[PDB]
């Protein structure tokens, strides 16, 4: 199975426009992941992450995106925030592995890396494993709007990654493997 096509891919998307890469019709090793100690979360729900080489799944879906350092804990079943509610929600019966690692040396230019966007306003909470790539002006009273106007904001904000920051604001590339 190609895990370099997911993990070693150069361009991860934003957290709001995340994407799935279906892994099918191949033998999967899974041992290129847990033999590495540089992963900062590697949290697996259901499976025990070392008993993955004797399980044959129907299909493996790999959701890949980029969050902030402190936003990694919202990638979990049942958690809430501005990433778990408006951007990327995991189901309560999630069976899979959440892998995250600190890509400060790639995604943090010292000028500022304002290319990864998250949604901070929405009308309601996302259903699990759903996506919202729509960028429409958000008005809290529900009427359509056109900025610049009062009570009218764009729903997407920029992370703004900097090299000289702590590990709670550093960029963390997140790959969420989902098994079925």
């Amino acid at each position, epitope marked *: 199975c190609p895990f370099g096509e997911v993990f070693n*891919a*150069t*361009k991860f*998307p934003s957290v709001y426009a995340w994407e799935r890469k279906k892994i099918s019709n191949c033998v999967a090793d899974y041992s290129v992941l847990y033999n590495s100690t540089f992963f900062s979360t590697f949290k697996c729900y259901g499976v025990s992450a070392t008993k993955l080489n004797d399980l044959c799944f129907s299909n493996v879906y790999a959701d*890949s995106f980029v969050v902030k350092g402190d936003d990694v804990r919202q990638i979990a079943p049942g958690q809430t925030g501005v990433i778990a509610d408006y951007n990327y929600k995991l189901p309560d019966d999630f069976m899979g592995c959440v892998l995250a690692w600190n*890509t400060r*040396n790639i995604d943090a230019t010292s000028t500022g890396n304002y290319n990864y966007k998250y949604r901070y306003l929405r009308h309601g909470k996302l259903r699990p494993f759903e996506r919202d790539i729509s960028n429409v002006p958000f008005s809290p009273d529900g009427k359509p709007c056109t900025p610049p106007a009062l009570n009218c904001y764009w729903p997407l904000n920029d992370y703004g990654f900097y090299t000289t920051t702590g590990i709670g604001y550093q960029p963390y590339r997140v790959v969420v493997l989902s098994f079925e």
Partner: antibody, heavy 127, light 104 residues
């Protein structure tokens, strides 16, 4: 002073192995990848293979595996490329080019390799 | 596999759009090189939108889905060169080069 000084021009026979060197200078040698790209006359650029100068592995083209073999010499700051069994289609200008990506801490996996920056002068070999 | 048109014919003054399409590029960077005939290529754009020093402020890269785009605003008479695009196989192995575009 960043520069990649290659070998000189050569002529070969269809089957004689060729050695093209790529002497590096200036930059920290074990940091950046060194790529190997050829170019047939009248054709576009063709990527052959790369090398990690701190002995961490090679990668070759999918239609050149078993023919091209690259190697590194840390003491002389040089990278050699060996092509065994040339054909009539392996007449090209052979470019040794650097990588625009300072590799460092373990190997921050997810890295942007490619972006060939400090291309060499080009060794022309004719079969 | 990365494909691109073989030639773009623009008079001095217009806008030349060198497109570069590849199915393995929603997640991979495009590196653009120019090669005036005779010498080594010169890297023009890197990481789909960024331009190194020494490259003038006419080139402006883009990426809309699985399609790259280099734009020369205000083409002069020293832009007659072959333009190549680069990618990988959605891993970071097997770097590929485009077919070339002789911009005239």
């Amino acid at each position: 002073q960043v520069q990649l000084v290659q070998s000189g021009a050569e002529v070969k026979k269809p089957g004689a192995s060729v050695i093209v060197s790529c002497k590096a200078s200036g930059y920290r040698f074990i940091s950046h990848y060194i790529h190997w790209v050829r170019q047939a006359p009248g054709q576009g650029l063709e990527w052959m293979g790369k090398i990690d100068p701190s002995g961490r592995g090679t990668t070759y083209a999918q239609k050149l595996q078993g023919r091209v073999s690259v190697t590194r010499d840390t003491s002389t700051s040089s990278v050699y490329m060996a092509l065994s069994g040339l054909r009539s289609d392996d007449t090209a200008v052979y470019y040794c080019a650097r990588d625009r990506f300072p590799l460092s801490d373990p190997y921050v996996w997810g890295s942007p390799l490619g972006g060939l920056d400090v291309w060499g002068q080009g060794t022309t070999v004719i079969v | 596999d990365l494909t691109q048109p073989p030639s773009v014919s623009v008079s001095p003054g217009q806008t030349a759009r060198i497109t570069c399409s590849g199915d393995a590029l929603p997640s991979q960077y495009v590196y653009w090189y120019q090669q005036r005939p005779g010498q080594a290529p010169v890297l023009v754009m890197y990481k789909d939108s960024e331009r190194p020093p020494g490259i003038p402020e006419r080139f402006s890269g883009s990426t809309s889905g699985t399609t790259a785009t280099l734009t020369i605003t205000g083409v002069q008479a020293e832009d007659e060169a072959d333009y190549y695009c680069q990618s990988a196989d959605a891993s970071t192995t097997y770097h590929v080069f485009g077919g070339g575009t002789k911009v005239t």
